[PDB]
Amino acid sequence: KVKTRIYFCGGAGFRIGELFHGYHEDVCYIDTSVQNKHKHNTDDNTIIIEADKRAIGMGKDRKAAAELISAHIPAIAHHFPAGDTNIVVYSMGGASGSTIGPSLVSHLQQQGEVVVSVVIGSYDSDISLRNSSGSLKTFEGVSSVSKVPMIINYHENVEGIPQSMVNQNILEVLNALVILFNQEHQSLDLMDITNWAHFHKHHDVPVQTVQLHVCFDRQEAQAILDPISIASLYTDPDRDVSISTVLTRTTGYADPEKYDFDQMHFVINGLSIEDIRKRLEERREMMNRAKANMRKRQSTLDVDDQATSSGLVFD
Ligand SMILES: Nc1nc2c(ncn2[C@@H]2O[C@H](COP(=O)(O)OP(=O)(O)O)[C@@H](O)[C@H]2O)c(=O)[nH]1
């Protein structure tokens, strides 16, 4: 098994993967569109799921995408087998990443794998907000069905903010995660990472969506409310000090000769998910208000009008 398999799904996943290229060898790409392919997509690392016969995307139709892709998931998972750790990357407001991604997480978690999702919330229209809300609900559904808390590292496409800034934050996270999982750190074993992610095995906590916060100093980790499970890396072992009360804690000692960071923390909590739910709820309340206030014009047809079988009408 590879140490870390990264699954880049849908357009956002493809774009992030193109930016991330060279930072990790064991990556793969799954989409419903050939258009999203770029210079780093090969026949060996990419699966394009064709619809009855073309691959032109799903255009934010989450239900259609799910109908298409669901039956292909076992084959895809067989083709790109799980790593010791697994990272799945996709947008929430689209159609393909937000179905392929969570479907892969569900399949992988049912096999007992360790999985983290890196995801993007959006709400630039009624349909994409509907998609992001469905995706948030999906995380909860996948947590329930796979019986393993679904871990999401969440990024919002804040209306008005250049997506390039969100992409950069995501790359920083993917880089940090790859280091965390690289199996080179003293005192940090594979089962240590496994039980950090699968903390539900040892604690009376709800099996539900949890949020992963990648923190680059002590103070950022400290700010995370009600932490459930924390993995910490130090280049100086003498700095290994528990930050706050936490259910599971695991630490690794990174080579200070190789690494120019003091410490990194990967903090899982549950509470922060509520902030996402609340944010989408508020956007939904605005959207429904706007919808309900849209003016509906009278038909241009009179009751005295006649139409031909093609729809031609003569005045
Ligand atoms: N931050 C960021 N957001 C993206 C990127 N690509 C797409 N998105 C967002 O994701 C939404 C869905 O697009 P896409 O991921 O291509 O949909 P999909 O192919 O059906 O999964 C878009 O409306 C954007 O809000 C990207 O490269 N970076």
From Swiss-Prot:
Q: Please tell me where GTP binds in this chain.
A: G11, A12, A95, S96, G97
What this protein catalyses is: GTP + H2O = GDP + phosphate + H(+)
Q: Which GO terms describe its cellular component?
A: host cell cytoplasm
Q: Does the keyword Nucleotide-binding apply?
A: yes
Tell me the superkingdom of the source: Viruses
- Annotated signal peptide: none
Major place of localization? host cell
Q: Which GO terms describe its molecular function?
A: GTP binding; GTPase activity
Note down the stretches annotated as region Disordered: 291-315
What subunit structure does UniProt give?
Homomultimer. Polymerizes in a strictly GTP-dependent manner.
What does the record's free text say on domains?
Answer: Consists of two domains: a nucleotide-binding N-terminus that hydrolyzes GTP and a C-terminus domain necessary for polymerization. The domains are bridged by a long, central helix. Interactions between the C-terminus and the following monomer drive polymerization.
Family label: Belongs to the FtsZ family. PhuZ subfamily.
Q: What is this protein called?
A: Phage tubulin-like protein
Organism in which the protein naturally occurs: Pseudomonas phage phiKZ
